[PDB]
Amino acid sequence: ECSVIGYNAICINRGLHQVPELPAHVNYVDLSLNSIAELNETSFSRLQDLQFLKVEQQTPGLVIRNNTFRGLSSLIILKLDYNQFLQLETGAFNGLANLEVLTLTQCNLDGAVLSGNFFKPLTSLEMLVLRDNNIKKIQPASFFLNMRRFHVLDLTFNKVKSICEEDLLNFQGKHFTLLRLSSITLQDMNEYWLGWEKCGNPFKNTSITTLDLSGNGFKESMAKRFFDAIAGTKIQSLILSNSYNMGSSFGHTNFKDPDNFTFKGLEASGVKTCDLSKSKIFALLKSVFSHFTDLEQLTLAQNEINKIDDNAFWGLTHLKELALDTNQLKSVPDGIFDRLTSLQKIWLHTNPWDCSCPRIDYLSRWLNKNSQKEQGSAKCSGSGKPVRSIICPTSASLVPR
Numbered sequence: 001e002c003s004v005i006g007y008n009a010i011c012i013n014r015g016l017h018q019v020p021e022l023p024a025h026v027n028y029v030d031l032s033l034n035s036i037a038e039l040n041e042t043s044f045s046r047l048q049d050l051q052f053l054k055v056e057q058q059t060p061g062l063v064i065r066n067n068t069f070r071g072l073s074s075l076i077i078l079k080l081d082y083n084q085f086l087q088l089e090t091g092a093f094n095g096l097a098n099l100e101v102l103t104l105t106q107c108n109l110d111g112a113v114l115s116g117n118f119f120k121p122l123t124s125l126e127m128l129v130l131r132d133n134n135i136k137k138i139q140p141a142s143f144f145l146n147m148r149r150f151h152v153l154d155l156t157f158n159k160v161k162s163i164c165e166e167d168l169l170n171f172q173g174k175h176f177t178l179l180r181l182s183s184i185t186l187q188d189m190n191e192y193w194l195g196w197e198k199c200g201n202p203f204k205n206t207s208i209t210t211l212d213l214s215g216n217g218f219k220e221s222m223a224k225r226f227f228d229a230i231a232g233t234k235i236q237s238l239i240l241s242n243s244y245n246m247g248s249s250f251g252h253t254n255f256k257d258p259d260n261f262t263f264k265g266l267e268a269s270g271v272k273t274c275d276l277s278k279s280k281i282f283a284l285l286k287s288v289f290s291h292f293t294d295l296e297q298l299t300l301a302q303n304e305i306n307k308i309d310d311n312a313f314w315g316l317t318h319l320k321e322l323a324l325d326t327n328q329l330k331s332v333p334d335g336i337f338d339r340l341t342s343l344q345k346i347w348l349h350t351n352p353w354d355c356s357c358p359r360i361d362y363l364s365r366w367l368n369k370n371s372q373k374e375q376g377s378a379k380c381s382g383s384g385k386p387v388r389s390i391i392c393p394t395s396a397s398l399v400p401r
């Protein structure tokens, strides 16, 4: 009951229990949402030309036998997502020497998938998506040393209590363009952990373009330790959004805003963009950012910021883009932006600005001189006029009668 148009065969949701007879010339086959219970060598022995195979969400318990993919040397993308309780025989992916993307989201997989030989045949793999599985420890087997182009790994929504040097030993040498460690908790990596000395540097001799550690809490004391531990790792862009424990509270005394020591390990990482948006930061302290010496973009949007110290931004001479919107700022100190000499864009909107004079004098004049840089429009609380338009009267002694 498939729809075969040209090189494409769409067999989505047709109540199939086996791979159906398709024409031998097809290169794109989608068999998602069916009742196929097992895939073996005879499953694709007539579809030898496939480039894109998709077999998502079968009825639960799909088994993939040894040599199912023998001689699909043309297959580049294989998607096996949402297959509850997936069973892989350990030579399941034999033959796939040219495969570049494998996605296995939500298949109840655990660490064995990365530590056994399941992925050994995949010498060309660039992109491995393993979201929302049950991986507790990221422990890649030794063949990963030889996957020259493995560069994208997404582990979002696994619960991984820690990441350590000896865990990631076979990722040493890699350059990851996207190492996505989002929403994995890193529960054990905190103030109270005795395992820090032994953990070392999970990223020893590894480089990263985008390191996504969002949604993992990152209380100030955890960030410090974590970035000391990975001190010196080349990272181009650092995502720490939804660091739900970052910032201070009158409620729990322990908790503090990040300081000039917090991000010191990132000193020589060459970070170009840093996202700390959507967190709980209440104050920007002296020199908190003074270690990102190559920083070009910084977002602190949607925190709870209501205090910016003199020198919050010391050492950000290369910064092009700064976002401070949607906080609780009534004011900023005089001259706070003066040494941001590469500033191209700034966001200051959705803050309750107090436009009393002479408090608002510096920000108003600045926002006017730099109106081409302001994205959106910071407004005065109460009146709702733009802060750009406020001309403060001058103090009487400066213009004597």
Ligand SMILES: *[C@@H]1O[C@H](CO)[C@@H](O)[C@H](O)[C@H]1NC(C)=O
Pocket (backbone or CB within 6 Å): 018, 038, 040, 041, 042, 043
């Ligand atoms: C493969 O699977 C089909 C049914 O799914 C079965 O009839 C056939 O004998 C199997 N062949 C091998 C080699 O496992």
Ligand SMILES: *[C@@H]1O[C@H](CO)[C@@H](O)[C@H](O)[C@H]1NC(C)=O
Pocket (backbone or CB within 6 Å): 066, 089, 090, 091
């Ligand atoms: C499948 O292939 C592997 C790896 O080479 C082999 O050791 C294993 O015994 C095979 N398993 C089965 C169940 O046939």
Ligand SMILES: *[C@@H]1O[C@H](CO)[C@@H](O)[C@H](O)[C@H]1NC(C)=O
Pocket (backbone or CB within 6 Å): 173, 174, 175, 205, 206, 207
């Ligand atoms: C890892 O170490 C080697 C020296 O052993 C070095 O030359 C190389 O650039 C490093 N690789 C990465 C990706 O940092």
